[PDB]
Symmetry: D2
């Protein structure tokens, strides 16, 4: 059975310890979901939503069942079936895939998919607290690092594996900086031309002691571009002869995104306007250290599953820019036209809230197909552990 997207929304993406600091991951998820629900008042929040599957990586200190909290906070009925999924950066795309599968199987007719992350408010852990440290120093671990940014097998940061990708595929410092700059320039242009306006819903920030309430309305990172400081930035993952910098890597970020999926049956009954159809998807994996070019494996699977014979049939691509090297390497391997890829800018400039980005790219991709006259789009996102997820959608 066909699976349609009828609504999408996302919060603006906040910087680490930035504009969305006062909000939890669940709260941000609620904002995005309320934004999406408001677009489809045909669907009754009190009755028509069968299931929620929501992405989140850093669940520590969020409380029981983050997807359940998001749904209830958004005003959805408590009869909703809820579950939270973690595929690191792929989490929210996996939520969409799983939601699509549920509709295809006839277990649900209306599914909420998406993801949320507050990397700001992910806590520190004390492993030795329960049993005791006994004697000598002990460590407080940054959860962002342990469960989000470091490889589980060698303990190294994803950025170190980005440096591996640079060596393996011959991608230079200067190539990565150029990609980064363009990502920022495209993101800034898109902001100025209102390209994100339909997809973003603002976050209300409560006023502090006589201060008025404010709205966070735009992504925080794009305005931070400083070309000269970017081009001379220190390499943070490898000191000597490095290529990856804080400027050309994606930042640490807070955000959420929501997508509403329905079956053909509901689309009819409810007189909903379909925005796009999920044509298919593909997921692949290989060596954990090679996660950066895993999307190159996933995309052909997605295309085959979608019944797309020629990759040139695809009008636009979204490759989540976990690093500038990720954007470059997959375009290179697949021999794609760069002008069709991340045309509004990507994660290097927009930000990368891990649990959100898998859906965020789909949301932005749909906006691109809608606003730039595209029919077929592909979204792919790599993930820590050596994997990637990819999805094909077609605008209606």
């Amino acid at each position: 059975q066909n699976v349609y997207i009828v609504s999408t929304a996302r919060t603006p993406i906040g910087s680490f310890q930035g504009s969305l600091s006062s909000k939890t991951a669940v709260e941000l998820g609620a904002v995005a979901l309320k934004g999406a629900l408001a677009k489809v008042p045909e669907l009754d929040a009190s009755k028509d939503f069968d299931e929620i599957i929501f992405g989140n990586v850093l669940s520590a200190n969020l409380g029981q069942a983050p997807a359940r909290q998001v749904a209830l906070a958004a005003g959805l009925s408590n009869h909703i079936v809820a579950s939270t999924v973690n595929k690191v950066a792929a989490s929210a795309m996996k939520a969409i895939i799983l939601g699509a599968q549920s509709i295809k199987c006839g277990n649900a007719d209306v599914v909420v998919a998406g993801g949320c992350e507050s990397m700001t408010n992910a806590p520190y852990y004390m492993p030795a607290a329960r049993a005791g440290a006994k004697f000598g120093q002990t460590v407080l671990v940054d959860g962002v690092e342990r469960d989000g940014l470091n490889d589980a097998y060698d303990g190294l940061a994803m950025g170190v594996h980005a440096e591996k990708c640079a060596r393996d595929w011959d991608i230079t410092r200067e190539q990565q900086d150029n990609f980064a700059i363009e990502s920022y320039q495209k993101s800034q242009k898109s902001q100025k031309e209102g390209k994100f306006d339909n997809e973003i819903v603002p976050v209300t920030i409560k006023g502090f002691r006589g201060k008025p309430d404010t709205q966070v309305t735009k992504d925080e990172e794009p305005a931070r571009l400083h070309v000269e400081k970017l081009r001379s930035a220190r390499t943070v993952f490898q000191k000597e002869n490095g290529t990856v910098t804080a400027a050309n890597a994606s930042p640490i970020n807070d955000g959420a995104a929501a997508v509403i999926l329905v079956s053909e049956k509901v689309l009819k009954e409810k007189n909903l306007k379909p925005l796009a159809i999920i044509k298919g998807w593909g997921e692949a994996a290989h060596q954990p250290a090679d996660f950066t070019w895993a999307p190159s494996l996933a995309v052909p699977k997605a295309l085959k599953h979608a019944g797309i014979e020629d990759i040139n049939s695809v009008d636009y691509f979204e490759f989540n820019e976990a690093f500038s090297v990720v954007g470059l390497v997959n375009t290179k391997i697949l021999k794609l036209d760069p002008s069709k890829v991340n045309v509004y800018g990507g994660a290097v400039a927009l930000g990368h809230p891990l649990g959100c980005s898998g859906a965020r790219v789909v949301v932005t991709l749909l906006s691109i197909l809608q606003q730039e006259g595209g029919k077929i789009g592909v979204a792919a996102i790599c993930n820590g552990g050596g994997g990637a997820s990819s999805i094909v959608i077609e605008k209606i």
Copy 2:
């Protein structure tokens, strides 16, 4: 398409700070999965396993992508597609459901489902660590409590909501103690008669400083039964006129379980012997505080989805005994014969590792159908947030 179970295995269930203390959640998951894989050497670990979906509630300090770690640790090929799912106590049953859906959709032919939990090794969190405490005392939160055992909406322990269930449905202290005692007695009898032998795989514990290696071979909790101490135990969630005790509630535990799912295509090609077919499933939810009797909502949905018209057609039931009141209340609402329910004992006596139990009940249910001459079995498990999942299987 039909989805078959071809292999199941579980670790023994360890007590809090007990027999499995030296093992992480991932390590326990690897043990269960290796046990299951060994039973089906027809399936090549290096090639035939398309996807893993694995349950886990307390992911803090486990490292990136717990399901990915479990798969790789078990010797599965790194081309496997992996994701981790959290539906609190329902996590591992949800993993099975999602895996079944993936096979039905044709995205995968061989899926590993299951779950793992180390509640012993779940860490403490320091929410104030990142931004600073500034002045005055601050709190270190027990992750087991915050993300596992406390309701996200009112902050109260699940045991407090168990007391609510007792009031609402008129279930007494004495009724709950009787259920608990029987659960222990049945579990002990089952251990003595070797009823768990086919499903349990042992955990090797490394020797400490000249000590030899040991095996953890049986569930730790059943031997702790002391009827007199149970019947006079203090009520821990409500001091005065209480009903729920540490003895009649499920304990905090460590464990894992794995189930291998295949399509009809693979079953044929590989000449695999099918153990059971997944007939259907059902999930429901309502008020978070009413999670205890949510299985009573889920089971009828499961039966309908399975095409089962008469509930008396079901030979055995597994209702996860998160509390003794949970075992009682759902049997009562559904007007079931208690003699068909949790016949080998349940979580009150066996233990309740949250991320594992959803699959653990399915594994045990299959053993019951196999060993006691049953055809149709139902497994259901409640979860924090107000939900429940249920599954119908049929022995082949």
Copy 3:
């Protein structure tokens, strides 16, 4: 027999998390001591210094032997006998007393006394860390509160006991506010007129990432006076019919002070200029909750020890203003002329680094005797636990 002050110095007093936040208590002690040493080059740092006794309350994470570290960091020869003393707020005054005793007994001829405190860099403690928290929430204790500001017997803040003083002795909110305003205005005059110029030595703050170093030269708190906000400030220790506020209580602060004492023999042999003679001292205590007016017991003991028959003979008094009510109550009980008391301002306006203040008031008192033409001075300081220390000096 006779004990002479030959040199004094103090750092500026920094605000909590303020201008001196980059320095440890030991570093501040070294600054003050180096300042004192530089004023008496007739005393050879490599030969002549027999002993150091140095006050400090919050010694956690300062490393072995704070007084020893201060002496060695200031360039004193490591043959010096070192010890650190804690009498809470009276610590640095007790250090002067003990140093004078050491000289009078003939055990030392040259003694460094004083004290230091960094309340900013006092750490949090985890009491359950060593043995383990086991299960459930555990508390991180703010060392400033546990060991500095809270009574050991009832656990209540010193400010709660300041309210008891206000009630017991009929000292109103308006009286305390008027006292605080006057303390700030005197402090502001002192800064404008350079009254602290001879006693204060600056602290160098290291520039970060290539930026130039800066100098902290004056006390941070006096400029913060806002009369209208002070008079409408919240009563922080008692909600209902309170009198004590953050504005009329002393703040939390960082700083250090040093005083160099010599015997009669050394004064002559080294041709030193005596600044003052320590005429005597007195210490007293009573109920812990009544610490606020313990100085009124200590001062008469000090006068007796100093052979001063009439309290009207004293030209100037320093009563450490732990709270405005402390300044008021001791003036009231001892029937003193307020124009003789804390004439350059006091701790309400200047700051109260616990381990420093007992010598800080002696430093300021001597400046007053020198610059205002006084002969006999009395310094007194209350301390948590129910005590006070007092000293009588005579300018030469």
Copy 4:
């Protein structure tokens, strides 16, 4: 002028996380002090006690003013002048010295001196807690190490500097082990023969959950001697060609000791029996790394102050055995008869509660003079930072 010891007492010395783990440093201090008080009922606890000076190294989480708390918990009148002193291991000996000085100056007539330490209940610190860790891993510091056992200047354990002593002074592994064995065997004889019976007062341990209270009556460490395991013990401070082990170094310990000092006037007026007179004292210091043999500088200073021309006049010596190498090196340098040194055993076998030991050795020394028929005794103790304190007593 003359200062007399009229009473002494000590707690048993408990092992790290051992027999006294349920007590705070303050509680242990109170036990010791109560024991001392009970031996001199001619001194009225409600009237006669002018001052307490009490040693303690690790004051974190003890609450305001440890010495004050000890005096009040022991039932002394709250008019007492209280202060806490830290000279690391020499703390409690410095307290005796300062108390004697206070009496000699005529400021006090009756002084409590001594010290207490609970190294078990010294807490962990979180230095980044107040201001925040921001990003990445942060360390919880063991207070025992940071403020007790590690040098402030190089951060190295005292045991590393003990290896420097062994190398500098040609003191072998075998010599240190033989010394340790002898210390244990002397301690075991002392326990068998009741040599500590008069000085030790027991500690009551509260029974948990209805169980009866128990009594800690003897030092915990002496019974642990295992000669064969000691001689093959690992060198813990230096891996290659090491000499210092956990067995031949002093342990980490909990305990307290109290000594009551009086003036000549009080001795006569209250018809008190003098036990000993404090003949004199000496303190010295040099390079921090050379603290081990600082007692050999302090002792000659003490003898000079005491008017003792010939060191052969001393009947018995207590050199605190921080390490076996400390006992050996000071005996070697001062050319003493080993049969006069630590004749009941020393800290290697008895334990080394840092803040207690400086008075503990004086307590034991007096017992030795009394029970073995000695007249003149010398106690000496080294301390981290490069110093030592020494005292000369004469039995009356």
